[PDB]
Structure formats: structure tokens, C-alpha cells
Design a protein around this ligand. Structure first.
Ligand code: SF4
Ligand code: SF4
Ligand code: SF4
Ligand code: SF4
Ligand code: SF4
Ligand code: FES
Lengths: 166, 120, 756, 127, 102, 127, 196
């Protein structure tokens, strides 16, 4: 029941969800290859708990928006995001997803927070694979409830808990 | 020359008694949106004083858009680390540890503090 | 017409065409430093050099195409290898001693030198041979840097390439020789002993200097030229409405510049229009206020309109006042007029309405002025309609409108020679003081206030005036097509305007009416004038009223409900107004205005941070609904349709409208409200002390009233209390004190008293 | 294309929008919530452009929490659009200097510009 | 006009500052004309149809996207093949959709 | 040769002299222009002791009455030059080793500079 | 080789031949003769159809016959049966209010997708197409992006305290018709070309 209502139990389940981040592959653009390189045999996102990679949205919690989110893919991704279990986290990978990138035009959503609740933002073009590990570590200590912004605020464990989805 | 248009410069006049820049003009506001920045190098290639020059840190992921606009005093050579790194050093009591090592820093980065080849 | 050939092309062209202008007319190009639009060309920069054949018989040496006339069937070569060689050489000579300040130069990308250099320099000399940019490896010229010549103008004597544009302008266009060189040879640098920059047209050199020597101090170190957000619009401070270009970036007004529109102003702006922009973005009202507990508090729009409904629930249509501001667009005046048709009230007016309507008279085209024979002026153009002075500089020198080429205003008009003589016999001026233009109008008689009407009588010929007045009568007679120019005193003094109308009809002659209000002729044309009762913009007659400016303090007293639509907050409002709302400035509105020559000019909106404002259109649409009367206007498009229906022509189209009704008012003459170019609300930053109030007196009158040469004397007027620096002047008649009326209260005579 | 409501009057604009909306079927209509300042929704203001395909509807910058009680009106508004069958919600980001003049442009320019610049939005962020 | 000035003489010549400034703000203006050059990519024939109008920015840039025309052969290729083989027969073509959609 | 250094060094001394005069007579001294090969040096080395190349003694009205310039680090025929505006007065100072700073062959003493500046103050300044 | 024979065939047919000094050839065919001529072009052995590039000449400083211009690219593979290697372009102007052009689907199936793109990017409808279905832009998108009267749709870049940038009013680089920040553009910045 939501991972709450005991001081030890919420710490425990937050620990589990933090290190057991099961990525949901959503490769969009050239960010995708520097995403996969965070799993190659120089630098693997295969230690923290993300070795296995369930392409299914019904089985993976972290959605890595790796590339430009073109508008014709937005509504589809929409349902794909709703086709995730509720304990889900959404990372915005790359400049084109986090921001509009250099493609300031009619074609691209200029910030993916519009359609999906973003957990962590990561600048870069392409973000070095180790920066992707840094972003998942950021998300790690966020879902543990150990993350603070520049204004001093603690951030909720799971973004996408605060939106009247519909 | 910024092809992504992430650089905004509000200028001002040097105060001769306590000047900040070498000429008669300095940058009162220098903010760069790391989410817009596509990391070209044209800013470095156009800078005639070598002031703005790309560095090395990549551990810059943060949680909030409006916090990813790095400011002048968040990029001056005096500083040691990225914004989330400094914020963690404050909320943690643990000094900044850079997660990269390089054989050496360029001359154009005079002053840039980094681990250098193992001399230390 | 005359035949010319540019390197491959044949052009028909009128004779007086400069070779450079014909070259551009063929679509070709040549560097340009010495010559300029509307300036007397002299071969100085030696940049315009072309090849000329006059038979194939090439000229022995290269002819200065900027100052070389054209002949029928003359061959012009601008592409010869030798031509580009010489052009690059001259460019290198010019660039020799520049201070290397481009990065910190606020002229930035908009430096004619930069562009001509990047165009013609470094001809491919004959491989991947290592090129060298500069050969001169000696020490460069260094002189005094960033010297403010005036609170508006900055001077960097290093960057000057010693063209003649600024001094040639100052001699020719304003007729104020307040700038010239000091030394000669290479040591030459610019200086003056006239430091305040007396000419009220000083700012325009700011734009002309092809280098960053002379810059706009008020826009120093804000942004680079290409970075600024450019919105072209029209300045509505005074009725000539020059075309301007407003540069804004990041929500605040950075810099105002001149926009070329030869119909009204060629490339010129007055110092007040161009440098008086600090007040737009500095401190202004962004929240509608409400008077509830004996004080003003920021309120929602809903609560403001609720209070409006309730305070006007029993508001009768014969007690509501509709008083608009002198910069009101055609749309606003038309809506107010239509509403007063519906909302039957006899008292509506606008801020700068004249007791004698300016619509009485046929508009005069300024190009018709250049073709005109004589100019009979009563009043001071420099203060009432500033750029007329500059247009007068074109007229009085026997200049005439150029032929309109394919590239518009010609680069080198041979009609303008240097140091041209200014005629003393082609115009006649009558002003209450020795007007600065009296230099060029020998026919002059310094009168006193309330004397105009008698001068007009004498010029009509029914009685005998002074020698000067009889001479002006004579010259007006001999003139076959003269132009009559009326000041603010006449337009506010019914009978004098009547006699002027009589003179300008009996002799076929157009009229220039210097309205104290900008869009006055449009509001008249759109129907803004009081009715029977007649509570005018200064009269405290109405019981409910809408005000868009600062009326006399006595105007407010007695009313039951008063609603002001301001942009800034005036103490007259936080103590007498019931509902105040934000109003956008003329910079940030959108619509059309009517010049004093009948030409409508657009206001495009500026991207300035207006706050939560709504245009006076929406304000009246909101105010009439509380009254039951459904307003016809809320948006701009319907306003454009109802305008075109009201028979107002397109932009730049001249609107023909005459008017026959006079509403005179007595004038209690003790103090004079001198018409001022500078406007009261412009006293911000660098205009603080420049747009100060002044009290001018004859030295005998000074000694009699004990007014020292430098005292800051406070004075009380129905228009408020203002303190003013005192000036002794020998031409002001005895017993009179000219108070500088820094508002659109020009030409008015009102009582008052001097506080201690 | 109609223009209903006024600036900074969430309740008046909302009630006029209820009345003028009626039983309009929005199965293929498009809703553009134009705003400024992409990130900071905490103080955001919102204008609405409703393109039904057969006629269009404009409401100026009168919605959003930047106005007192604007978020409650915006909540009712998005709930209303969702009730009538809307599926496609869009947000266009324009400069504050644009938003005000934009409502004075001809219908074709305003509508073309907005439909060109639109960002697909999750309506949940405004509920 | 084609290459920015060398970085060392920015402190010697005015012309250096002019060319650096203009090139990095405006750039250069090539002549009016259209151009194309082909090359061999890991996915076949590539080229740019570049129309320049004499301005500092190209008038139009069209890309001959090799994977874009190459993809038309999918219904033919995978016609009659197995369902699993529809994957290899795509991978055998090496598509890059950043190239195709473009 | 390397005398350049002492020249620039002596140049500093000259500036020092200038400042003293300004502080005595209560006249505004202003740093006019710095070294370009020091502003525009990006990674390049800079060996000069100061960054300032041109300065002046300005009256109350801002018009200078005494101007001084020194040749840059990379220019040929290195010198120091002096000028009186409006007075067609120009001086060419060198630095000869052992003797000192010379106007031609005449050494340039501090008191000579003071007399020239005082004459300038009395004569040229408007206020 | 077949390019030379195209030249000797067309020049007698009154077809102008556009050439820049770089080695690229344009052959302008009118609307009608286009279809049968290019059918013969395939019959001449033009196997390979590289490009179909759509052009909007609206904002070009010099005017042109028509707003839209469609260019096909015909080639002959050097390594096939009879490989010459002749590659050249065929330009055909298309009216703004008559965006008609018969398809080359019957000759090449390659123009299946390519032409569709031009119907997506431009208002050009290609007659004789198997299926003109919008390829790239979203289904609900209204209009044709690449024509100059269609906005690019830029969105401002954001900063800390109200400070923003609108790029189209920010860009310092000049297009062909933008005269520049001085009174005009001449010399190198009205076109520059080095002489080898
Ligand atoms: S940020 Fe760079 S690497 Fe990532 S999708 Fe955008 S262009 Fe590609
Ligand atoms: S690398 Fe420099 S020029 Fe490129 S986007 Fe970043 S700030 Fe702009
Ligand atoms: S200051 Fe400017 S306008 Fe005047 S002569 Fe020098 S370059 Fe020409
Ligand atoms: S005036 Fe022109 S050449 Fe001189 S520093 Fe300014 S932009 Fe550069
Ligand atoms: S003369 Fe009048 S309209 Fe022209 S700039 Fe000055 S105040 Fe504005
Ligand atoms: S010499 Fe200046 S252009 Fe003729």
C-alpha cells in the first residue's frame, strides 16, 4: 500500500525501489547510443541493479527519455507512460527532452515535463554515459527521500504521484 | 554565435577604482541554460579574451528546470564543482569529490583546478 | 532623360543625379563614408571612386563618384580590378588608427565601417599563400576616450575617422554651429566650447556617425545592436509624429532611434523624443487601485468593475465626463464619440483640445512646404512642432524634394552644396520672444502675449502694424503660394485663429496648426468636442468623469465619482480619484494617429512590460457596461472596420476634414505657459535637470519682483504646483513672466502666484 | 473566430465560456492553453484558443493561479473540456510581449502561429 | 571571408577584430546559386541540395537521406519472409530513423 | 632589446607622477585606455607590469589638458609620447640607459613634468 | 555518355541548359513535355532516381517564374549492364495556386515516399500517386511546413528573472532580403566568390 505508514518500512521499500530501478527502454534519438554505451563493456549501467532491461512498460519503473520527443510520438508515449505500474519514475535524458535543445521549432516538445512528470533532468549533447549514471544516482537518492533543491526543499520520492492524471 | 541561444549577457561599465574586467566593459549578468546548451565550442572560439571556455565536468544532473540555469558565480574558475555537487557538500558536510581525471588541463584553462596526471 | 551605364546595365536618370546614386540605382555598390542622405557631399573619404568613360575614353584619374555629376551616356566601371584595389587601399587607410574596441563598442554590428570593410577589403592579391591583414606595425593614434559631450551624448575621439557628417549636419540641418574640429593633420579631434549641446536636435548625429565615437549615453552598455528587439512605431509626444524605431530587450525600454519616413521626418528625431524615453520603463503603475477605506489599495479587475457598477448604478448620462489624453489613438476617440452619441452627455473633450479647433484649416504637406513660396510663422516651431525647423532648413536654403530613385532617399544629392546660404527673406516670423529661428527670418517683431490677434489683423490689412508687420503683409501679398504656420497661442485664442482662417482662404494658402495635442485633429475628425454645457478638459463641470491625464486640481473638486486611467501615479490621484487603473504609454499601444498635416501614422505595440494593463478601448468598454450602454468597441479589428467606415484612409493616407465651430474661453493673463518641447513627465535620469521648469523674466521685472538669476522659485497654477529655475532674459517684455509649460498646456494663459 | 471574456477576470471569462460553449462536440477539436514562462507554473497565467474546426474561440490571459482564484477556474475549465470529449490538449509558449498583441492579430495569423508552435501537454498538470 | 582570423593576432590588428566579429555574428555571404555534392555513407548515397541566396544564411538545405529512400524496399524484402525474419531483414538494411524521419 | 621593460616600468613611474599632480591640485585623473594585448590575450602570456596604455589629466568639464601615451608590447619604434590638446604641442620621450628618460637629449625630470602640468592647469582648463 | 545524348536531344528541342562552373547540370522542362520526356529518359536507360527536392522560391531576392520548383535527379549506375555514370537534374516549376504534377510512380516506385514528402512539406499534390498519405508531420497538422509563409514556430529561451530572448528578433545573420543593420549591403555581403 504505497510504501508508507511505518518509519522503518518506508525506508526499506524506498531503499529497494532506489537500487532496484528497472529501466524501461524508450530510445528516441542520438541520445540513445550514449545511453546504451552506459551499458557497454567500458561503462555498464548493469551494477546498480539495471543489468536486465524489460522493454515492456508493464514491468519496468524508470522511463529514460533518451532523445528528442517528437510530437507524433508524444501521445503514444503518453499511453506508454500510463502503461507503467504506478511505482514508476521518469527521467528526461538529453537536452532535446529536458529542454527544446537546439531544435526550437514546430516539430518538438520544448520540454517533456509537458506530457510526462519528469523526475530528473540531465543536460548534455550527448550526456556522457557516466552522466547518465550520475542522473540515476540523483534519482536514487531522490526516491530514497534524500534529495533537496536549491531552495532547500525535499523532493517527493516518486514524481508522477502529484498529477490528477485522469 | 550561440546556435542554441542559451547565453544572455547584461553588460555594465567597469568601475575604474575597483575594475572587474580588463577593458571598459564587463558582464554584469552571465547566465547559461545547460538544458539549452548543446556543447558546440563556438562560444570559446569567438571569445576574444578567452573568458568563456568549456570545462570538463559532466556530473550536472539536477531535478528542477529553473535550477539548471547556471549563473556566473556558479561557473567562475574560483569554484570547485557543479551545482548539485556543491549543494550536496553543503547538505552533507562532505567536501566536493570530482568524478573525473585528465592527463592535464589545457593552457586556455589557466587556473582550472583538476586532477593532473597524478602529481598530487 | 539622361543615359548612364553601370558596368553592365543601362539606367535612365534625371540630370542632377550623383554618379554614386545612379550606381546604387543600377543595383551596384561602393563604400560610403563622406556622403550621406540629405547632407552636402564632399569628396573626403575618397571611397566612392569609380571608373568613368566619356566618349571609350577613361578619365585620367579616378573621379569621385559621390561628388561627380553625371553626363548623358557615361560609362561607369565599379568592378575593374584596379577599382577594387583602390577601394581596399582607402579602407585600409581609414581603418589604420581605430582603437580596437569592437567587442566593447555599443555600436556593435551596426558600424558602416565594419560592413564596408568586410565587403571590399583584402582583394585576392596575386596558392594558399599566408595572408597578412595589416602592414602598418607602428603605434596607433590615441586621444581622450568616452568623453560625455552632454548628458545625452558620449564622445570617443579615437574612433572618429574624420568624416564631416556631424559638423556638416550641425551647420546645415539645425543651424547651430556647436561642434567642429580642433587641430589639423592626423592630430585632428572634435571639440566645442558649447558643451550643453544647445540645439534641440543634437541627438541625430548619434545615429549618423558610422563609428562608435558619438553614442547615446542613455543607452550605453545595455545590449548590442543586433540583440535589441526592434519595433518600429511613431512618437506621439507632439503632433508631427516622426517615424521612430523603439529598441527593447528583456521587458525594458533600452533605446529610441529615428526611423526614416521622408513624408514627415527624413531621418531626424528631436532630442526630447529620442532621449526622453527613460520614464517609460522606470516606475509605472502595474496594478489597478481602488479607493475603499480613504486610501488606495491594489485590487482585482473584478472588484474594480464591481465598484464601478455600484458607484455608477444611478449615474445619469448628463453628468458623466469623458476626457481623453492628447496621445489618444483614432480608435479611442472614435469609441468615446460614438458612446457620447449613445450616452448623451454634452461635456466630452480631450487633454490638448484647443479653444479654436485646428481642423479649421487645410493641412499643408511638408513637401508642399518645400515647394512653397513663403512661410508666415506665428509661434515657435522649435518648441511647438520641432522637426519643422529641420524641414525649414530644407525650405529656407531653396532646397526642393529630390527625385525618388529605386533605392529611395538619394545618397548624394548635388542640390545640397556645403555651407549653403540661408535666406533672410523667404519667411517671416512673429514670436512672443526672440525665437531661435529669428536668425533666418529677418522679418521679426517680439510681441507680448495677447498681442497675436492684432498682428493678424494688421497682416490682413484692416489696420496698420509695425514696420516688420507691414513687411510681412507685403511679402505675404507678393507670395503666390505661401504657407501659414500657426502656433499654440493662436490656436487657443479664438479670434486670431478666425483671422488666420480668413487670411489663408482669401489668399489660397495651406496652414500648419501646431496643436498642443498630438492626435487632436484625429479626435476632432473622430468627433471629440464638448456640447452645450461645455465642461471641457480643464473645466470642473461634470459630476462623474473619466480622466486620462492630470487635469487642474480644481477640476476634480465637487464630482461624485472620478475615474482616472493613468500609467504612473500622480498625487492628484491618490487624493482625489476613486478608481485608478494602469494605462499603456504611446510606445506600447497599437492604432493610428493623425499628424498636424492630416497624415495618419501607426502605433505598433512595443514589447515593454506594461504590467496587467488594458487599453483605454477596453477601459471604456468596461465603463459603459456599468452604465447600461453597450460599447461597440473592445478589440482592434472592429476598431479598424469602424474607422474605415467612418471614412479615414489607410496609413500614410491623408484625411480631409474641415470643421466649423468655435468654443472660446476668457484667458486670465498674468503668467505665460511657454510651449515646451520637453514634456514634464520626462524628468527621469539624464533628463532630470534638462526638462526642468523655467521662469523667464525681464531683468527689470526680475529686480522688481526680486527674482535672482538662479533661484528655484515655486509657482502655483490651476494645473498644479511646480518649482522652476529662474532665467533673466532681455527680450521678454516688462511685466510678464514666461513659465515653461512642460506639459500639453502650451499656449495657455492662466493666473497664479509665486511661493517662497 | 469569437473573443469572449477579458484579461484577468477568471470568473467572468469562465461563466461566459460556459454559456457560449453549450453542447459543442469536441471529438476532433483542439485546445491551446497559451502561456509564458515554460517552467514556473506556480505563478503562471493562461490564455485559451479553442479550434473546433468549424469555428474558433478565444479567451485572453485570464486563467491560471497568477490571478486570485484562477487555478480553480482553470480546473473547472479543463474538467469541462474533458467532459465534452476533448483528448488533444496543447500549450503554446509565447513571450509576454507577444501574448497581448497576439489577440489583436487577424484570426488567420494568430491561429496559424499558435497551431504551428504548440507543445503537446498533459492536462493533468493544470488540474 | 571563409575562415575566421587566427586567434593570436586579435591583439594586433583592427582588421582582425572586424573579421572575427563579423564572421562570428553575421558570418559570410556566398554567391547566389544552388549546389550538391554526393558522398558514400554507411547507408549509401548522400548529398545536400543547398540553395544560397547571397545571404549569411542558406536559402534552403535539402538532404538526400539514403535510409529514407532505402526504406521503400521493406514491403518487398520482408514479403513472404517469416515474422521473426522481418526483424533481421530490417537490421540487414541498417536503418537510422534520425536519417529517415529527418 | 629588453630596455622596453624599464621603459614600461618608467612608464608606470610617469603614471605615478601624473597621479600625484591630480591629488595635489584636486583635479580628476582618469584611466583612459588599457592594453589590448592584455585584454585580448586569452591563453597567451603577458609580461608587462601594468595593463594601462593611455591616460590623461582632465579638467572639471572633462576636457583633458595633458595627454600621455606609450607604445604597445608588439609595435615597432617603441616610444612614449606626450600631447597638449588645443595647443599643437607634442613631445617624444625615450629612455636612455644610465642617463634616464629623455626628451630628445634632455632628461625628463619630475619637476619639469610638474611645471608643464601647472602651466596647463592655469592656461587650458576651462573650469 | 547518355548525358551527352540527352544534351544533343534536348538542345534541339529548345530546352535551356543551366550550368554553374562546378559540374552540375540542370535541364528545364515545361509541364506537359515533362512526363513523356522523362518516360523516354527511363527508356534512355535512366535507372536510378536519386532525389525529388521541393523548393519554395518565394523569399528569393530575384523573382522566379513560379513559387514552387520540384527537381528530380536521374542517374545511370556505372557498375550495372550499361554503366555510364551520367547524373543530372530535371527542374520543373509548379504554380502556387496550381500545385499539379504527374507522378513518376509508373516509371520508378522510388518516388512513392519522396513525392509524399513534398505534399507534406509543400502544397504540391502529385497526380497519379498510389497513396498520397502525409508521411512526416503529425496527422492532425494543418499546412505544409517548408514553405516560407509557414512559421518555423520558435519558442523563447528561458533564464532567471524575466530575462528572455525571441530568436527571430535576435538573429544577427542576414538572409538575402534583409538589407542589414547599416543602410544596405554591398560588396562581399551581397555575394562573394573567390577565383581559385
Ligand atoms: S541532446 Fe544531442 S544527443 Fe541528445 S537527442 Fe538532442 S541532438 Fe541528440
Ligand atoms: S557550446 Fe556555447 S555556443 Fe554552443 S549551445 Fe553551449 S553556450 Fe551556446
Ligand atoms: S565624429 Fe563621427 S560623424 Fe563626426 S567627423 Fe568623426 S566619424 Fe564623422
Ligand atoms: S566604431 Fe566600428 S570599427 Fe570602431 S570599435 Fe566600434 S564597431 Fe569596431
Ligand atoms: S519632433 Fe515631436 S514627434 Fe518628432 S521625435 Fe520630437 S516629440 Fe516626437
Ligand atoms: S568620397 Fe566619400 S563617397 Fe565620394
Amino acid at each position: 500500500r504505497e510504501g508508507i505508514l511505518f518509519t522503518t518500512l518506508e525506508k526499506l521499500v524506498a531503499w529497494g525501489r532506489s537500487n532496484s530501478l528497472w529501466p524501461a527502454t524508450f530510445g528516441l534519438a542520438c541520445c540513445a547510443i550514449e545511453m546504451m554505451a552506459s551499458t557497454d563493456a567500458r561503462n555498464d549501467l548493469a551494477r546498480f541493479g539495471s543489468e536486465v532491461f524489460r522493454a515492456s512498460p508493464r514491468q519496468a519503473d524508470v522511463m529514460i527519455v533518451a532523445g528528442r520527443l517528437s510530437k507524433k510520438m508524444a501521445p503514444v508515449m503518453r499511453r506508454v507512460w500510463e502503461q507503467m505500474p504506478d511505482p514508476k519514475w521518469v527521467i528526461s535524458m538529453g537536452a532535446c527532452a529536458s529542454s527544446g535543445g537546439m531544435f526550437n521549432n514546430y516539430a518538438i516538445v520544448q520540454n517533456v515535463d509537458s506530457v510526462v512528470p519528469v523526475d530528473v533532468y540531465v543536460p548534455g549533447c550527448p550526456p556522457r554515459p557516466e552522466a547518465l549514471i550520475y542522473a540515476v544516482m540523483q534519482l536514487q537518492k531522490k526516491v530514497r527521500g534524500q534529495a533537496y533543491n536549491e531552495r532547500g526543499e525535499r523532493l517527493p520520492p516518486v514524481a508522477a504521484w502529484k498529477r490528477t492524471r485522469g | 554565435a550561440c546556435p542554441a541561444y542559451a547565453i544572455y549577457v547584461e553588460p555594465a561599465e567597469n568601475d575604474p577604482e575597483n575594475p572587474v574586467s580588463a577593458g571598459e566593459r564587463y558582464a554584469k549578468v552571465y547566465e547559461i541554460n545547460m538544458l539549452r546548451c548543446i556543447f558546440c565550442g563556438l562560444c570559446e572560439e569567438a571569445c576574444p579574451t578567452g573568458a568563456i571556455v568549456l570545462g570538463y565536468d559532466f556530473e550536472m544532473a539536477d531535478y528542477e528546470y529553473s535550477d539548471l540555469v547556471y549563473g556566473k558565480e556558479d561557473m567562475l574558475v574560483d569554484v570547485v564543482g557543479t551545482k548539485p555537487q556543491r549543494r550536496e557538500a553543503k547538505r552533507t558536510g562532505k567536501p566536493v569529490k570530482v568524478g573525473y581525471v585528465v592527463p592535464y588541463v589545457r593552457p586556455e584553462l589557466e587556473g582550472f583546478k583538476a586532477p593532473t596526471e597524478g602529481g598530487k | 532623360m539622361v543615359r548612364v551605364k553601370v558596368n553592365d546595365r543601362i539606367v535612365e536618370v534625371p540630370p542632377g543625379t550623383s554618379v554614386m546614386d545612379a550606381v546604387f540605382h543600377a543595383g551596384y555598390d561602393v563604400p560610403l563614408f563622406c556622403s550621406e542622405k540629405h547632407l552636402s557631399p564632399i569628396g573626403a573619404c575618397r571611397m566612392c571612386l569609380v571608373r568613368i568613360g566619356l566618349p571609350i575614353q577613361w578619365q585620367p584619374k579616378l573621379a569621385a563618384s559621390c561628388v561627380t555629376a553625371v553626363a548623358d551616356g557615361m560609362v561607369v566601371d565599379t568592378l575593374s580590378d584596379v577599382v577594387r584595389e583602390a577601394q581596399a587601399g582607402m579602407v585600409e587607410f581609414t581603418l589604420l588608427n581605430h582603437p580596437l574596441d569592437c567587442p566593447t563598442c555599443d555600436k556593435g554590428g551596426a558600424c558602416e565601417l565594419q560592413d564596408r570593410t568586410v565587403e571590399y577589403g583584402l582583394y585576392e592579391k596575386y596558392p594558399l599563400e599566408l595572408p597578412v591583414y595589416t602592414r602598418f606595425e607602428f603605434t596607433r593614434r590615441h586621444v581622450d576616450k568616452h568623453h560625455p559631450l552632454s548628458p545625452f551624448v558620449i564622445l570617443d575621439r579615437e574612433r572618429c575617422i574624420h568624416c564631416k557628417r556631424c559638423v556638416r549636419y550641425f551647420e546645415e540641418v539645425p543651424g547651430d554651429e556647436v561642434l567642429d574640429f580642433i587641430e589639423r593633420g592626423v592630430h585632428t579631434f572634435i571639440g566645442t566650447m558649447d558643451f550643453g549641446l544647445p540645439s534641440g536636435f543634437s541627438g541625430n548625429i548619434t545615429d549618423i556617425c558610422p563609428v562608435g565615437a558619438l553614442l547615446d549615453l542613455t543607452a550605453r552598455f545595455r545590449a548590442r545592436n543586433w540583440e535589441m528587439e526592434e519595433t518600429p512605431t511613431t512618437c506621439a509626444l507632439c503632433p508631427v509624429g516622426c517615424g521612430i524605431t523603439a529598441d527593447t530587450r528583456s521587458g525594458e525600454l533600452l533605446r529610441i532611434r529615428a526611423r526614416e519616413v521622408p513624408e514627415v521626418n527624413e531621418i531626424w528625431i528631436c532630442d526630447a523624443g529620442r532621449f526622453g524615453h527613460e520614464w517609460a520603463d522606470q516606475n509605472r503603475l502595474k496594478t489597478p487601485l481602488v479607493r475603499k477605506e480613504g486610501r488606495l489599495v491594489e485590487a482585482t479587475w473584478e472588484e474594480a468593475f464591481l465598484a464601478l457598477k455600484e458607484g455608477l448604478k444611478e449615474a445619469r448620462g448628463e453628468e458623466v465626463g469623458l476626457y481623453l489624453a492628447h496621445d489618444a489613438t483614432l480608435e479611442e476617440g472614435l469609441l468615446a464619440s460614438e458612446l457620447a452619441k449613445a450616452l448623451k452627455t454634452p461635456h466630452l473633450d480631450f487633454q490638448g483640445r484647443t479653444a479654436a479647433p485646428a481642423s479649421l484649416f487645410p493641412p499643408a504637406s511638408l513637401e508642399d512646404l518645400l515647394q512653397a513660396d513663403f512661410a508666415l510663422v506665428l509661434g515657435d516651431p522649435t518648441e511647438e512642432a520641432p522637426i519643422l525647423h529641420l524641414r525649414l532648413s530644407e525650405f529656407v536654403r531653396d532646397l526642393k524634394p529630390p527625385h525618388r530613385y529605386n533605392h529611395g532617399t538619394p545618397f548624394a544629392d548635388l542640390q545640397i552644396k556645403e555651407r549653403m546660404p540661408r535666406r533672410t527673406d523667404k519667411m517671416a516670423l512673429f514670436a512672443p520672444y526672440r525665437a531661435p529661428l529669428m536668425k533666418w527670418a529677418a522679418i521679426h517683431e517680439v510681441h507680448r502675449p495677447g498681442e497675436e490677434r492684432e498682428i493678424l489683423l494688421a497682416l490682413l490689412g484692416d489696420k496698420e502694424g509695425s514696420e516688420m508687420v507691414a513687411k510681412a503683409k507685403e511679402a505675404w501679398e507678393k507670395a503666390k503660394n505661401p504657407v501659414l504656420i500657426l502656433g499654440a497661442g493662436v490656436l487657443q485664442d479664438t479670434v486670431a485663429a478666425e483671422r488666420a482662417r480668413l487670411l489663408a482662404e482669401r489668399k489660397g494658402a495651406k496652414v500648419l496648426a501646431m496643436t498642443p495635442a498630438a492626435n487632436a485633429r484625429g479626435l476632432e475628425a473622430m468627433g471629440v468636442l464638448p456640447g452645450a454645457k461645455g465642461a471641457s478638459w480643464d473645466e470642473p463641470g461634470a459630476l462623474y468623469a473619466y480622466y486620462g491625464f492630470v487635469p487642474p486640481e480644481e477640476a476634480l473638486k465637487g464630482k461624485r465619482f472620478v475615474v482616472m486611467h493613468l500609467s504612473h501615479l500622480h498625487p492628484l490621484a491618490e487624493r482625489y480619484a476613486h478608481v485608478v487603473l494602469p494605462a499603456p504609454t504611446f510606445y506600447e499601444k497599437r492604432g493610428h494617429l493623425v499628424n498636424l498635416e492630416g497624415r495618419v501614422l501607426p502605433l505598433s505595440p512595443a514589447p515593454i512590460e506594461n504590467g496587467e494593463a488594458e487599453g483605454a478601448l477596453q477601459v471604456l468598454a468596461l465603463l459603459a457596461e456599468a452604465l447600461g450602454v453597450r460599447p461597440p468597441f473592445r478589440l482592434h479589428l472592429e476598431a479598424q472596420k469602424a474607422l474605415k467606415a467612418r471614412k479615414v484612409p489607410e496609413a500614410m493616407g491623408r484625411l480631409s476634414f474641415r470643421l466649423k465651430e468655435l468654443r472660446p474661453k476668457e484667458r486670465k493673463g498674468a503668467f505665460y505657459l511657454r510651449p515646451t518641447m520637453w514634456k514634464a513627465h520626462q524628468a527621469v535620469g539624464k533628463a532630470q535637470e534638462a526638462a526642468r521648469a523655467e521662469l523667464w523674466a525681464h531683468p527689470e521685472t526680475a529686480r522688481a519682483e526680486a527674482l535672482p538669476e538662479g533661484a528655484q522659485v515655486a509657482v502655483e497654477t490651476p494645473f498644479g504646483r511646480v518649482e522652476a529655475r529662474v532665467v533673466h532674459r532681455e527680450d521678454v517684455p516688462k511685466g510678464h513672466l514666461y513659465l515653461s509649460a512642460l506639459g500639453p498646456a502650451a499656449g495657455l494663459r492662466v493666473e497664479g502666484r509665486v511661493l517662497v | 473566430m469569437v473573443r469572449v471574456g477579458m484579461r484577468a477576470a477568471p470568473r467572468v471569462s469562465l461563466e461566459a465560456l460556459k454559456a457560449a460553449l453549450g453542447g459543442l462536440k469536441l471529438s476532433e477539436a483542439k485546445v491551446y492553453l497559451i502561456t509564458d514562462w515554460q517552467d514556473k507554473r506556480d505563478q503562471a497565467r493562461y490564455a485559451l484558443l479553442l479550434h473546433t474546426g468549424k469555428k474558433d474561440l478565444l479567451v485572453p490571459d485570464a486563467f491560471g493561479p497568477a490571478f486570485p482564484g484562477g487555478e480553480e477556474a482553470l480546473s473547472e475549465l479543463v474538467g469541462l473540456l474533458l467532459a465534452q470529449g476533448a483528448r488533444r490538449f496543447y500549450e503554446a509558449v509565447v513571450s509576454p510581449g507577444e501574448m497581448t498583441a497576439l489577440l489583436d492579430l487577424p484570426p488567420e495569423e494568430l491561429l496559424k502561429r499558435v497551431m504551428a508552435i504548440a507543445n503537446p501537454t498533459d492536462p493533468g498538470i493544470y488540474l | 571571408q571563409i575562415t575566421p582570423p587566427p586567434r593570436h593576432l586579435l591583439e594586433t590588428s583592427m582588421e582582425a577584430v572586424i573579421y572575427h566579429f563579423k564572421h562570428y555574428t553575421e558570418g559570410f555571404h556566398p554567391p547566389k546559386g544552388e549546389v550538391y555534392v554526393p558522398t558514400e555513407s554507411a547507408r549509401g548515397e548522400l548529398g545536400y541540395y543547398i540553395v544560397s541566396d547571397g545571404g549569411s544564411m542558406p536559402y534552403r538545405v535539402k538532404v538526400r537521406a539514403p535510409s529514407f529512400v532505402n526504406l521503400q524496399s521493406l514491403p518487398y524484402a520482408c514479403k513472404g519472409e517469416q515474422v521473426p525474419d522481418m526483424v533481421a531483414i530490417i537490421a540487414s538494411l541498417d536503418p537510422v530513423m534520425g536519417d529517415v524521419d529527418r | 632589446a629588453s630596455s622596453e621593460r624599464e621603459l614600461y616600468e618608467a612608464w608606470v613611474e610617469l603614471l605615478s607622477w601624473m597621479r600625484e599632480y591630480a591629488q595635489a591640485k584636486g583635479v580628476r585623473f582618469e584611466k583612459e585606455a588599457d592594453f589590448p594585448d592584455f585584454i585580448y590575450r586569452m591563453e597567451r602570456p603577458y609580461d608587462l607590469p601594468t595593463t594601462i596604455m593611455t591616460a590623461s589629466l582632465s579638467d572639471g568639464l572633462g576636457e583633458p589638458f595633458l595627454l600621455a601615451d606609450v607604445s604597445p608590447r608588439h609595435a615597432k619604434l617603441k616610444r612614449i609620447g606626450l600631447r597638449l590638446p588645443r595647443a599643437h604641442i607634442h613631445l617624444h620621450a625615450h629612455y636612455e640607459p644610465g642617463k634616464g628618460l629623455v626628451t630628445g637629449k634632455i632628461p625628463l625630470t619630475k619637476e619639469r613634468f610638474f611645471a608643464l602640468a601647472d602651466r596647463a592647469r592655469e592656461a587650458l582648463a576651462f573650469a | 555518355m547518355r548525358l551527352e545524348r540527352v544534351l544533343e536531344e534536348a538542345r534541339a528541342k529548345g530546352y535551356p541548359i543551366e550550368d554553374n562552373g562546378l559540374g552540375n547540370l540542370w535541364v528545364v522542362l515545361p509541364r506537359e513535355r515533362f512526363k513523356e520526356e522523362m518516360a523516354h529518359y527511363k527508356a534512355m536507360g535512366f535507372n536510378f532516381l536519386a532525389d525529388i527536392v521541393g523548393l519554395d522560391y518565394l523569399t528569393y531576392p530575384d523573382p522566379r517564374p513560379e513559387r514552387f520548383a520540384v527537381v528530380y535527379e536521374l542517374v545511370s549506375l556505372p557498375g550495372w549492364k550499361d554503366g555510364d555514370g551520367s547524373r543530372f537534374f530535371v527542374r520543373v516549376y509548379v504554380p502556387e495556386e496550381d500545385p499539379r504534377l504527374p507522378t513518376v510512380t509508373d516509371l520508378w516506385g522510388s518516388a512513392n515516399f519522396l513525392e509524399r514528402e513534398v505534399y507534406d512539406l509543400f502544397g504540391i499534390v502529385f497526380e497519379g500517386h498510389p497513396d498520397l498519405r502525409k508521411i512526416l508531420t503529425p496527422e492532425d497538422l494543418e499546412g505544409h511546413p517548408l514553405r516560407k509563409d509557414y512559421p518555423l514556430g520558435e519558442t523563447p529561451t528561458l533564464f532567471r528573472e524575466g530575462r528572455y530572448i525571441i530568436p527571430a528578433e535576435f538573429r544577427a545573420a542576414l538572409t538575402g532580403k534583409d538589407p542589414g543593420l547599416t543602410f544596405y549591403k554591398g560588396g562581399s555581403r551581397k555575394g562573394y566568390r573567390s577565383l581559385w
